[PDB]
Symmetry: none
Subunit: 122 residues, 2 copies
Amino acid sequence: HLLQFRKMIKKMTGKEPVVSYAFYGCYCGSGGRGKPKDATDRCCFVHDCCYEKVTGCDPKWDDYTYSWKNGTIVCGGDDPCKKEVCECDKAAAICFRDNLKTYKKRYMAYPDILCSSKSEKC
Amino acid sequence: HLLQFRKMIKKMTGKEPVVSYAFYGCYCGSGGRGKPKDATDRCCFVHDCCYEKVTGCDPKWDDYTYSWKNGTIVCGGDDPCKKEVCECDKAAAICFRDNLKTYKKRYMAYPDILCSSKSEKC
Ligand SMILES: [Ca+2]
Ligand SMILES: [Ca+2]
């Protein structure tokens, strides 16, 4: 669920997820088109593609089971669709942390008109 | 950066870049489709293809290092991506100057639906 995803981004980056990531670049908001603007945005692009692959449950609005073991996020439960969603979210929140070095504030509420037409393929 | 591209265009063609070039043909505007209508538009098509080949930086918002040396634009800096962007802009500035003799005012704000369906490849 969206709020579990937000918990993981806050924990992994220290950044409050909504102003810092919900509108970043060409892919971090609802939708997405064009070419990813930088690595953070490319994290959002892989996360969008990861969600498109989920058949069987709602990626944005169902809850999954995860817990924190020794500094890392562990996706569990016995529903394979929900755990698949959890793995998308975990992967994106780690990717955000690893690309915190190139994070540009100029891309934080990026104008959708600046995103190319030619959308990158997954 | 876009503004640096515009300065090179004014200096090479003497025309004020937006009015004369920002909407020309099927490729000088944002996006582009169809085939190039003439040689100025093909300058724009090569420049769109040039920006598509750039990753690592942002063609529109990053400012690169360049200078004039004896009536020639010279791209420098030690960041290879940005110099590529500079090189893409310099070539189109020169290409618009070299094709001012077929610049058709009829293509100045050319309706994009008039552009053919099968886009040319880079
Ligand atoms: Ca998105
Ligand atoms: Ca164009």
